[PDB]
Write an enzyme that holds these catalytic residues in place. Sequence first.
Site, short mmCIF file in Angstrom:
data_model
loop_
_atom_site.label_atom_id
_atom_site.label_comp_id
_atom_site.label_asym_id
_atom_site.label_seq_id
_atom_site.Cartn_x
_atom_site.Cartn_y
_atom_site.Cartn_z
N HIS B 41 0.78 -1.34 0.02
CA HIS B 41 0.10 0.10 -0.01
C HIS B 41 0.91 1.44 0.24
O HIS B 41 0.47 2.35 -0.30
CB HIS B 41 -0.95 -0.01 1.10
CG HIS B 41 -1.78 1.27 1.23
ND1 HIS B 41 -1.43 2.13 2.36
CD2 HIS B 41 -3.08 1.64 0.76
CE1 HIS B 41 -2.38 3.18 2.07
NE2 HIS B 41 -3.35 2.76 1.31
N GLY B 143 0.53 5.08 11.17
CA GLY B 143 1.80 4.89 10.93
C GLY B 143 2.67 3.46 11.45
O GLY B 143 3.84 3.62 11.72
N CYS B 145 1.70 0.71 10.07
CA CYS B 145 1.80 -0.36 8.93
C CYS B 145 3.21 -0.89 8.78
O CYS B 145 4.09 -0.14 9.17
CB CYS B 145 1.43 0.25 7.54
SG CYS B 145 -0.22 0.36 7.07
C1 LIG Z 1 -5.42 4.17 13.43
N1 LIG Z 1 -4.59 3.02 12.88
C2 LIG Z 1 -4.41 1.89 13.43
N2 LIG Z 1 -3.70 0.90 12.53
C3 LIG Z 1 -3.46 1.71 11.27
C4 LIG Z 1 -2.68 0.94 10.33
N3 LIG Z 1 -2.95 1.84 9.10
C5 LIG Z 1 -1.80 2.94 8.83
O1 LIG Z 1 -0.65 2.74 9.43
N4 LIG Z 1 -1.69 3.74 7.65
C6 LIG Z 1 -2.87 3.90 6.85
N5 LIG Z 1 -2.82 4.59 5.53
C7 LIG Z 1 -1.58 5.50 5.40
C8 LIG Z 1 -1.89 6.74 5.30
C9 LIG Z 1 -0.64 7.52 5.15
C10 LIG Z 1 -0.42 8.86 5.11
N6 LIG Z 1 0.90 9.32 4.62
C11 LIG Z 1 1.66 10.56 4.58
N7 LIG Z 1 1.29 8.00 4.59
C12 LIG Z 1 0.55 7.03 4.86
C13 LIG Z 1 0.55 5.56 4.95
C14 LIG Z 1 -0.65 4.92 5.29
CL1 LIG Z 1 0.07 3.22 5.16
N8 LIG Z 1 -4.01 2.75 6.96
C15 LIG Z 1 -5.23 2.97 6.08
C16 LIG Z 1 -5.15 1.94 5.15
C17 LIG Z 1 -3.82 1.09 4.93
C18 LIG Z 1 -3.54 0.13 4.14
F1 LIG Z 1 -2.66 -0.45 3.84
C19 LIG Z 1 -5.03 -0.26 3.21
F2 LIG Z 1 -4.72 -1.08 2.28
C20 LIG Z 1 -6.17 0.49 3.48
C21 LIG Z 1 -6.16 1.32 4.26
F3 LIG Z 1 -7.37 2.03 4.65
C22 LIG Z 1 -4.13 2.00 8.03
O2 LIG Z 1 -4.97 1.34 8.50
N9 LIG Z 1 -4.02 2.83 11.57
#
Ligand SMILES: Cn1cnc(Cn2c(=O)nc(Nc3cc4cn(C)nc4cc3Cl)n(Cc3cc(F)c(F)cc3F)c2=O)n1
Lengths: 306, 302
Positions: B41, B143, B145
């Site tokens: 992702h 953050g 992932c």
């Molecule tokens: C609150 N929470 C609890 N667990 C998680 C896991 N998670 C994450 O860490 N990041 C996500 N979206 C990103 C946004 C970004 C913005 N910037 C600048 N960089 C970013 C990187 C990511 Cl990876 N998401 C959402 C998400 C991530 C995916 F890999 C997916 F396939 C679908 C999704 F809806 C997330 O859930 N967050």
Amino acid sequence: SGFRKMAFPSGKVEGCMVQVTCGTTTLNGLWLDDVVYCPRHVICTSEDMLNPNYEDLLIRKSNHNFLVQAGNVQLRVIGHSMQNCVLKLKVDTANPKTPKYKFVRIQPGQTFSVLACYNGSPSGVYQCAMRPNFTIKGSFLNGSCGSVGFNIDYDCVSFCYMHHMELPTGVHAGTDLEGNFYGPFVDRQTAQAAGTDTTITVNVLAWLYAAVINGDRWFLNRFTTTLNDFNLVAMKYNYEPLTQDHVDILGPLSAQTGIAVLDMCASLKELLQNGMNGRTILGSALLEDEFTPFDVVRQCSGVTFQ
Amino acid sequence: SGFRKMAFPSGKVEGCMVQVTCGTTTLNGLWLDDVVYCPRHVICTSEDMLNPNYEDLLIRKSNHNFLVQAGNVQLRVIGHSMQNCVLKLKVDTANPKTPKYKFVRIQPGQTFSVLACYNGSPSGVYQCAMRPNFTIKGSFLNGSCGSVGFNIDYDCVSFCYMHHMELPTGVHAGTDLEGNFYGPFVDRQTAQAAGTDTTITVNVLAWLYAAVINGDRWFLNRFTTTLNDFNLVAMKYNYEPLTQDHVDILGPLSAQTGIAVLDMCASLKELLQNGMNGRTILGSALLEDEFTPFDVVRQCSG
Ligand SMILES: Cn1cnc(Cn2c(=O)nc(Nc3cc4cn(C)nc4cc3Cl)n(Cc3cc(F)c(F)cc3F)c2=O)n1
Ligand SMILES: Cn1cnc(Cn2c(=O)nc(Nc3cc4cn(C)nc4cc3Cl)n(Cc3cc(F)c(F)cc3F)c2=O)n1
């Protein structure tokens, strides 16, 4: 989101755990710089124990008696000495994996990660809380002596605990890294127990704030109490008196949740009286007192500790 | 004595965490040998959130687009491939802290530790169970992932989870280290939801044996039950059915405590029809299901 009992990443501490052997007695040691720290109960035989004379038992020894085992590399000991109930073995080599570290002593209710090790090899990590009765409710099999409790601040590992013994009630007791026992204990085999434990009220209120951050908002009433009225009810149910310092610490959580302390002490007052009416807060069927208010910030707002 | 939830020493995984940045997307990466594993992702943007064609987006990036940061040390990506939902990145330096590792895929009810990481910086460690609905009730923020789940077996790290996304219920879904999702979930922003969760019964019975081992004994009865009469009641309480396998795996606990498995199943059957009448088991007022028979034997006596 989500809420778990979390420990600090035990990486920095794992590189300092070593095996210390005196006679047939074996336990774990903490190797920082060129000194190995371990319980002074290692120079004890079941022939002594019971009623010892550590200072006496101590001097009558040698430096080849102590087998400081770091992995499968052995360490030459070049000097011993006491410091309260902790023995310090001076060895010929500084630990290259020595972190930024300091020895600290924690108040009751404060929390720390525990790296439980057996024969110098770290086995498990978990998150403890110093109970009011100066015990910790750990999980320790035999040979856990030398397991150390710690916290991490940026890159500084704050060693605050070292395991020593299990009470017959099942809980555990130890010292700081300077030998001072936590609580009314001594390091020998006698019938010992501490005062009847009490709930860390300040930690429960911080746990309720974590439940509100996680959307679990059913327990929130509409009322408000006073520190005088709350502590009177708190004494009844074996709860610790909440003080003004405890309140100010919950300040950030109050403003970030939109609720208020005393307003939260209203909810806790009701919960302490009615029970939860078959409902759960963060899925727990009790009230959690093992999260300090700074723990909840570290897990919901959060900072990393590398 | 004393029974705690106990995660593995996260030391070997900390030395593998890195920070992977693609364009503006910054998640955590798992640095093993000269490869860096991370959720695919990371190659997405604002327009690519709902229906990303990752193969299009991957033949759509060059090696100079990826920024990997192990501490102060930027690593040079020299190749980028894809296996299912995990992105694989060839770097020109191997991680000298790489442990003895292997990739395994766990079944629901299996436990593992989780190293929560943010910007490649480990922040905490805890114990999860893979729920029967293939999610985990973890603790994660934005953050996180790339945060990995793992077990350790004689200094050999078994990597079995990689966190990818959080679901609307607040539970979390990820993949194995081969990028295959646990459950009917896809790395997209398509509105997704997991099945109704259930209690891992064999883990509860294992936890009850751990209580009797710790002398706790407020909850046993003179009764026994047939495996089918037990499953008939347990299912009525959102509990998992208990297979003949589950009965055999509880074998050694039934041995070391002299309480036959179907005797304990009766003690659990009674527990579900009454509650606990105030009392607690091992300090819990609910029935624990994040201890496998392995962990129970691991942590307990001999
Ligand atoms: C609150 N929470 C609890 N667990 C998680 C896991 N998670 C994450 O860490 N990041 C996500 N979206 C990103 C946004 C970004 C913005 N910037 C600048 N960089 C970013 C990187 C990511 Cl990876 N998401 C959402 C998400 C991530 C995916 F890999 C997916 F396939 C679908 C999704 F809806 C997330 O859930 N967050
Ligand atoms: C079940 N449990 C819970 N906590 C503990 C911690 N603990 C321990 O690990 N060891 C102890 N006695 C030893 C016996 C040895 C046998 N060999 C070969 N080597 C041994 C080393 C020790 Cl250290 N004890 C008992 C104990 C240790 C003390 F340091 C003390 F001051 C009083 C005590 F009663 C122990 O509690 N085990």
